[PDB]
Design an enzyme around this catalytic site. Structure first.
Site, PDB file in Angstrom:
ATOM      1  N   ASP A 167      -4.015   1.421 -17.067  1.00 57.55           N
ATOM      2  CA  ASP A 167      -4.490   2.453 -16.434  1.00 57.55           C
ATOM      3  C   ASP A 167      -4.375   2.221 -14.949  1.00 57.55           C
ATOM      4  O   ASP A 167      -4.106   1.343 -14.434  1.00 57.55           O
ATOM      5  CB  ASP A 167      -5.865   2.680 -16.974  1.00 57.55           C
ATOM      6  CG  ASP A 167      -6.536   3.881 -16.738  1.00 57.55           C
ATOM      7  OD1 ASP A 167      -5.807   5.017 -16.108  1.00 57.55           O
ATOM      8  OD2 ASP A 167      -7.730   4.123 -17.047  1.00 57.55           O
ATOM      9  N   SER A 168      -4.473   3.401 -14.234  1.00 51.24           N
ATOM     10  CA  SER A 168      -4.758   3.114 -12.804  1.00 51.24           C
ATOM     11  C   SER A 168      -6.343   3.058 -12.624  1.00 51.24           C
ATOM     12  O   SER A 168      -7.083   2.762 -13.383  1.00 51.24           O
ATOM     13  CB  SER A 168      -4.444   4.421 -12.046  1.00 51.24           C
ATOM     14  OG  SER A 168      -5.239   5.725 -12.508  1.00 51.24           O
ATOM     15  N   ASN A 197       3.776  -6.540   0.178  1.00 52.28           N
ATOM     16  CA  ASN A 197       2.572  -7.131   0.280  1.00 52.28           C
ATOM     17  C   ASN A 197       1.779  -6.389   1.650  1.00 52.28           C
ATOM     18  O   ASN A 197       2.328  -6.562   2.572  1.00 52.28           O
ATOM     19  CB  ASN A 197       2.726  -8.526   0.727  1.00 52.28           C
ATOM     20  CG  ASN A 197       1.416  -9.386   0.786  1.00 52.28           C
ATOM     21  OD1 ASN A 197       0.328  -9.054   1.274  1.00 52.28           O
ATOM     22  ND2 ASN A 197       1.651 -10.583   0.150  1.00 52.28           N
ATOM     23  N   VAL A 242       0.861  -8.990   4.680  1.00 52.87           N
ATOM     24  CA  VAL A 242       1.949  -9.574   5.412  1.00 52.87           C
ATOM     25  C   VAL A 242       2.840  -8.621   5.861  1.00 52.87           C
ATOM     26  O   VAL A 242       3.358  -7.950   5.235  1.00 52.87           O
ATOM     27  CB  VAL A 242       2.748 -10.690   4.318  1.00 52.87           C
ATOM     28  CG1 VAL A 242       3.726 -11.625   5.117  1.00 52.87           C
ATOM     29  CG2 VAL A 242       1.841 -11.621   3.641  1.00 52.87           C
ATOM     30  N   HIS A 299     -10.206  13.340  -2.147  1.00 57.40           N
ATOM     31  CA  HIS A 299     -11.541  12.456  -1.996  1.00 57.40           C
ATOM     32  C   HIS A 299     -11.303  10.952  -1.463  1.00 57.40           C
ATOM     33  O   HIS A 299     -12.038  10.594  -0.775  1.00 57.40           O
ATOM     34  CB  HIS A 299     -12.006  12.228  -3.441  1.00 57.40           C
ATOM     35  CG  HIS A 299     -11.182  11.055  -4.335  1.00 57.40           C
ATOM     36  ND1 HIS A 299     -10.379  11.178  -5.257  1.00 57.40           N
ATOM     37  CD2 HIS A 299     -11.437   9.600  -4.353  1.00 57.40           C
ATOM     38  CE1 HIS A 299     -10.015   9.905  -5.678  1.00 57.40           C
ATOM     39  NE2 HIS A 299     -10.568   9.087  -4.931  1.00 57.40           N
ATOM     40  N   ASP A 353      -8.216  17.894  -6.272  1.00 60.75           N
ATOM     41  CA  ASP A 353      -8.170  16.876  -5.591  1.00 60.75           C
ATOM     42  C   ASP A 353      -6.774  16.670  -4.934  1.00 60.75           C
ATOM     43  O   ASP A 353      -5.852  15.765  -5.397  1.00 60.75           O
ATOM     44  CB  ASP A 353      -8.501  15.782  -6.421  1.00 60.75           C
ATOM     45  CG  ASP A 353      -8.865  14.438  -5.694  1.00 60.75           C
ATOM     46  OD1 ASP A 353      -9.121  14.334  -4.501  1.00 60.75           O
ATOM     47  OD2 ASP A 353      -9.150  13.535  -6.409  1.00 60.75           O
ATOM     48  N   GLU A 367       8.257  -2.227   7.062  1.00 62.61           N
ATOM     49  CA  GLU A 367       7.149  -1.478   7.338  1.00 62.61           C
ATOM     50  C   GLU A 367       7.470  -0.539   8.363  1.00 62.61           C
ATOM     51  O   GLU A 367       8.034  -0.898   9.510  1.00 62.61           O
ATOM     52  CB  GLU A 367       5.969  -2.268   7.781  1.00 62.61           C
ATOM     53  CG  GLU A 367       5.234  -3.148   6.813  1.00 62.61           C
ATOM     54  CD  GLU A 367       5.953  -4.709   6.761  1.00 62.61           C
ATOM     55  OE1 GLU A 367       7.003  -4.722   7.412  1.00 62.61           O
ATOM     56  OE2 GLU A 367       5.322  -5.352   6.107  1.00 62.61           O
ATOM     57  N   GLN A 399      -9.795   1.795  -9.341  1.00 57.60           N
ATOM     58  CA  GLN A 399     -10.230   1.896  -7.960  1.00 57.60           C
ATOM     59  C   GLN A 399      -9.313   1.460  -7.033  1.00 57.60           C
ATOM     60  O   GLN A 399      -8.768   0.179  -7.275  1.00 57.60           O
ATOM     61  CB  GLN A 399     -11.672   1.363  -7.817  1.00 57.60           C
ATOM     62  CG  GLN A 399     -12.841   2.252  -8.597  1.00 57.60           C
ATOM     63  CD  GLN A 399     -13.076   2.195 -10.006  1.00 57.60           C
ATOM     64  OE1 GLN A 399     -12.723   1.167 -10.619  1.00 57.60           O
ATOM     65  NE2 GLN A 399     -13.421   3.213 -10.550  1.00 57.60           N
ATOM     66  N   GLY A 400      -8.941   2.037  -5.860  1.00 50.80           N
ATOM     67  CA  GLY A 400      -8.090   1.724  -4.859  1.00 50.80           C
ATOM     68  C   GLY A 400      -6.465   2.395  -4.951  1.00 50.80           C
ATOM     69  O   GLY A 400      -5.684   2.127  -4.147  1.00 50.80           O
ATOM     70  N   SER A 431      -6.247   5.465  -5.927  1.00 51.59           N
ATOM     71  CA  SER A 431      -6.497   6.914  -5.642  1.00 51.59           C
ATOM     72  C   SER A 431      -5.512   7.375  -4.629  1.00 51.59           C
ATOM     73  O   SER A 431      -5.330   6.599  -3.743  1.00 51.59           O
ATOM     74  CB  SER A 431      -7.952   7.433  -5.580  1.00 51.59           C
ATOM     75  OG  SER A 431      -8.461   7.215  -6.630  1.00 51.59           O
ATOM     76  N   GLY A 432      -5.035   8.542  -4.880  1.00 46.35           N
ATOM     77  CA  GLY A 432      -4.004   9.036  -3.801  1.00 46.35           C
ATOM     78  C   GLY A 432      -2.421   8.999  -3.966  1.00 46.35           C
ATOM     79  O   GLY A 432      -1.826   9.456  -3.298  1.00 46.35           O
TER      80      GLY A 432
HETATM   81 CA    CA Z   1       3.417  -5.611   4.573  1.00 50.20          CA
END
Ligand code: CA
Length: 223
Positions: free
Chosen positions: A171-172, A54, A57, A40, A84, A62, A174-175, A177-178
């Site tokens: 809980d988990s 973060n 930032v 989804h 899903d 990364e 919105q955002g 997901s996945g």
């Molecule tokens: Ca970062």
């Protein structure tokens, strides 16, 4: 994640953020060139962001790598959220290190009562909206099938499990997901859906990854 804690930077080294100008879903790195997420979460224009803490930032660990291919499960049903799961191939291999690392796929399915780690950058409020900048974590047990079905009549398939707390509060959301549900060092779940977040008798529902290991392996082997 509602009712969780700040994970700590790069303590969840398989957690990725899917970015299309902004964070919109989590995912899990399963080898140097493949991520598994929720179907989804599918869209065009995905950049996979590895090594994040973060997400607003640049902190120095990364790796930003575009997707070359995305493969939604052949049997995904967007109305029921059955199956899903999707795979995302990276244009180039990630450099693996202590802060950017793949997570093992399960050898066997996990049982109710097992503790898992659920993580993400989703909403931290069950009423209202506050989206964190840093990665949040929640330790939660897998719930029995029977209690999952009783919480969500007519909605839980053999490709889903519930995890969390029937009393609510944790809980988990919105955002998230996945993103990953990791138990005993194996990726057993993908954040999929729920009714609201952290509500009593409405635990999160997760894609049951062990059912998909064959498909994941054979898809990777030919793509
Ligand atoms: Ca970062």
């Amino acid at each position: 994640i509602v009712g969780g804690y700040t994970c700590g930077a790069n303590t969840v080294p398989y957690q990725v953020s899917l970015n299309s100008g902004y964070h919109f879903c989590g995912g899990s790195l399963i080898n140097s060139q493949w991520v598994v997420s929720a179907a989804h979460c599918y869209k065009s224009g995905i950049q996979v962001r590895l090594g994040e803490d973060n997400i607003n930032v640049v902190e120095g660990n990364e790796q930003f790598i575009s997707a070359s291919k995305s493969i939604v499960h052949p049997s995904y049903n967007s109305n029921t959220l059955n199956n899903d799961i999707m795979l995302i191939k990276l244009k180039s291999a990630a450099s693996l290190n202590s802060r950017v690392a793949s997570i093992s796929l399960p050898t066997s399915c996990a049982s109710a009562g097992t503790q898992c780690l659920i993580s993400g950058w989703g909403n931290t409020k069950s009423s209202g909206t506050s989206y964190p900048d840093v990665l949040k974590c929640l330790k939660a047990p897998i719930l029995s099938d029977s209690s999952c079905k009783s919480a969500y009549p007519g909605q839980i398939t053999s490709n889903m499990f519930c995890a969390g707390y029937l009393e609510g509060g944790k809980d988990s959301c919105q955002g998230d997901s996945g993103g990953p549900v990791v138990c005993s060092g194996k990726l057993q779940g993908i954040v999929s859906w729920g009714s609201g977040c952290a509500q009593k008798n409405k635990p999160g529902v997760y894609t049951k990854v062990c059912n998909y290991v064959s498909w994941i392996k054979q898809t990777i082997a030919s793509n």
